[model samples]
Target chain A: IPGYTYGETENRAPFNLEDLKLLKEAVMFTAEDEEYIQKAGEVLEDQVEEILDTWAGFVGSHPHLLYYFTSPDGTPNEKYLAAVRKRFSRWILDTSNRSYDQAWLDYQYEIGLRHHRTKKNQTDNVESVPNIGYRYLVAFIYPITATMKPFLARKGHTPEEVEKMYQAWFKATTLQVALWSYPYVKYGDF
Target chain B: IPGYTYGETENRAPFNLEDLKLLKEAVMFTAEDEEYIQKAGEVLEDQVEEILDTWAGFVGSHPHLLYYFTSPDGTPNEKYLAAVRKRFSRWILDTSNRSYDQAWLDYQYEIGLRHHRTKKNQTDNVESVPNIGYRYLVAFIYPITATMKPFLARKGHTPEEVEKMYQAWFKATTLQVALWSYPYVKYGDF
Candidate 1:
């Protein structure tokens, strides 16, 4: 019958307040940056599907990533590919939503664990899902954010405004990827 | 087009040989210990279902633990509970099997990650599912190991023999729990 209970003071999440604050501070995620992100999201909303399709196509050609999108029989799974593509499209908008709550923090941890080799059997992708290594995840930040810069610039923003938007996107993406890397890098030394 | 590749030397599992060796050395799992485990498993094989039923029932009644077993509508999810009960039964048998390969080690890590706040949407228990905190998981080690000792003892073994089996089970469960705690404990100093 022996058991332990958590007090109110100890009711902290895995990704605590301090961690989020540190991340925000590092990224300079102020109100102005939030405004830039919201505007960018609104402007780019129309092309979100095309953006994700191109991104997914690019990822599918990669040797490592190709394995994840393949069926158990080693054929391309268009069904699963399309499913993830839709999620990916929604993720872009969600990233710019600026709603940093417990649910959001928890979802980031979930994303990190999914990318790792943790729960393959329980994943939505049942067949030939390759465990995404942390290396690929870290390496991915560059192409993803960098590729979006042109799209942001095409939204009729000035060069300086475009740079500001790109910087915001870069830092935001980095912050997210860093959050997603928690389950991977937290255990091992950076 | 830049991407990362795993070199030949980097083909190591998260729980490698050294990790298993360290765990065995720490737990003093000799051949005799393995024998004790095998014998106990055989004796209790028939009762695995009954044991898991009792164990699940106990867990379902706990104030904190019950939350995980309930559905979004706050009703008892018998189907999900039944599914988990079967896995729980298999887990006991697997623990005493003594086949600690890389797959076995990897599955343990997967179980740990699943029990944490990670992989919420991918899991079958979808709506309003509270993330299984590490505290409850660590707390579970006690009741589980303690509850199983009597079952092992009831197999007509001598007092000394039963003691050995109990110790072996204790150590084995502790080792598994420690492995399960890796995702939780490795990050923070806690």
Candidate 2:
């Protein structure tokens, strides 16, 4: 939380709460979705490392994907990778654990800006690749959601419950991805 | 195609030809769709004005959508509107008439940059409101395509033929939209 910089005024989110509500409506993120995502949190809390291991393996083998974490000389920055991995592991919990409060809204903007060249490498002070491609951010949604289905089923939840959790996770990630795309656009055009 | 800065080194495209082919495959755009689009172009060539009139009405009725062509004081910037409309009308032709060659690909990036704040208001050299919202760009897709279907049918084509034309138009618009989104992303991130 020390370096999180959530809700910092200097990094204020351009979008208002009403816009977030509009996005939620666009994605049809419902009340039931919140509950199911919470249900997923319980299972995912313990499986964060495993899920990330799978994600890392996929990203590592794919040079195009790995390029985001590499130097101009094509070497991976180990400290940068570890630092982001630390936050990303926590992100799994926050996705399920946190409410969509003002802090959350502000943090989403920070996350987006960090992924874009705008604030990328700023938080960690790393000189790795400048930015992550927005396409991979979008394309990752599918595999991340698909991979989570197995984790959700790890518990004794019914098939229906697991499916609901999966759907909610899908919607939740989409909502975040859409928010994350804001910095990629021109000013108010987002 | 004068003023069309297609493949001009000064206005060079960041995406390569192979990227275009990959996007086409991603959209499942087949060879048959190109044939249908060319067929639709024959009908659309004459109907551009009427179709634009309908589009103008829709955009005019919505203050949010119209704001892109307006001054900071909420007044419609007539010259700016006319200028953009001139090119937009031409885009309908380009959609059908042009090949996905160097010119077309380079122009997509230009179009996107023009709509984005990166080059907003640069083309028209007007002091109107800058940067059209990406939301409207996407939201406009449905109504534009839906309205064009009737125009496609106006040429006395069979129902199946009309349907094919509409479908082709839809796919073509989608392909262009995807290309246009390239500029909204960060450097090397598109």
For candidate 1 chain B, the 10 contiguous residues with the lowest summed lDDT are B1-10
Which portions of model 1 show Cα errors greater than 4 Å?
A1-190, B1-13, B120-125, B186-190
lDDT by residue (tens digit), candidate 1, B111-174: 6666665543244545546466443443354456557877887878787888677667766665
Candidate lDDT scores, in order, read 0.62, 0.74
User: Poorest 10 consecutive residues of model 2 chain B by lDDT?
Assistant: B135-144
Checking candidate 1 for backbone clashes, the offending pairs are none
Q: Write the per-residue lDDT of candidate 2 for residues A61-157, one digit (tens) a residue.
A: 7666677888778988887788888888888888998898777888998898899988888888878877776655654554566567789998888
Candidate 2 CAPRI assessment class: incorrect
TM-score of each: 0.46, 0.60
Model 1, residue A108: what's the lDDT? 66
TM-score of chain B of each: 0.83, 0.92
CA lDDT for candidate 2: 0.74
lDDT of 1 by residue, A80-163 (tens): 666666657777887777476666676666666666666432446466555654434434554576578778878676888786
Best by TM-score: 2
